[PDB]
Amino acid sequence: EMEKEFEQIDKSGSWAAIYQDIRHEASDFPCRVAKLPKNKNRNRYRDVSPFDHSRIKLHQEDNDYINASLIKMEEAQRSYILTQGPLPNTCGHFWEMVWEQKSRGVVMLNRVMEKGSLKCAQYWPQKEEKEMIFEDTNLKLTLISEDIKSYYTVRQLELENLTTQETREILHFHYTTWPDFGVPESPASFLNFLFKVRESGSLSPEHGPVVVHCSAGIGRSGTFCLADTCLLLMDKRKDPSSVDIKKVLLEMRKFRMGLIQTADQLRFSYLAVIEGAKFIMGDSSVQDQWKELSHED
Ligand SMILES: O=P(O)(O)C(F)(F)c1ccc2ccc(C(F)(F)P(=O)(O)O)cc2c1
Secondary structure (H helix, E strand, C coil): CHHHHHHHHHHCCCHHHHHHHHHHHCCCCCCCHHHCHHHHHHCCCCCCCCCCCCEEECCCCCCCEEEEEEEEECCCCEEEEEECCCCCCCHHHHHHHHHHCCCCEEEECCCCCECCECCCCCCCCCCCCCCEEECCCCEEEEEEEEEECCCEEEEEEEEEECCCCEEEEEEEEEECCCCCCCCCCCHHHHHHHHHHHHHHCCCCCCCCCEEEECCCCCCHHHHHHHHHHHHHHHHHCCCHHHCCHHHHHHHHCCCCCCCCCCHHHHHHHHHHHHHHHHHHCCCCCHHHHHHHHHCCC
């Protein structure tokens, strides 16, 4: 039982050991491009780079580089794009990517400012009367509307390719109370938030991979994607307990490094998956319970 194993790990306080085993077994691929001197200012952190084999390439001719990774989950039938929280000089790239990948949604798991330090840049407009134009990638972005909740805000954005004048509605899901190296404020909050994204249709195969990011795009982003993939996994393979979260994470770390940055987020991943499992295997109310418990209102 998923529950039994979880309690065993907790009872023995093995979360740090398991998490540490994951780091040591994690894949390690080259990041030549990410480390090219010219791209130095395109990476928020020196030690966090997308693997070359899976990095998302901008279709631009100058520099196709952006600190983003395509996490393709074969069995789970779902791809995501994990990227760092855009930098002052990479906002055009970010949206360029969102455009070229035909993304429908963007999941932000961090705040533009955490403890006097900017964990990310204001890459989307805060006021509707002030659209944003990223001149380098010839993109226009406009806040159409937004639904502000207690711990998360969902925004409707219109992304326009100024070149072709083509337009697209991007759904911006912003979890606002997930601290760096911290965890969601309950499995309920998280799942409540994950299912909003799901019901939005942003994760649908009819759209490009959803863009998920935090600060470095590995900790919170990793946690969010791990949870979503495991729940996705234990629904298609009818035999949920066979889903080995630790291994799913390892599968994931093959496409981007450092997914899940703390033993606690790893534990949370298990909690969120176990909790969210109640949905996959019946119970059409736990979702109303998460919404209730998340106190989003
Ligand atoms: O999403 P989180 O909370 O996991 C994060 F973004 F806060 C986080 C994650 C990975 C990091 C790696 C390196 C640095 C660095 F400080 F070492 P560097 O020296 O490479 O800039 C900072 C990092 C911060």
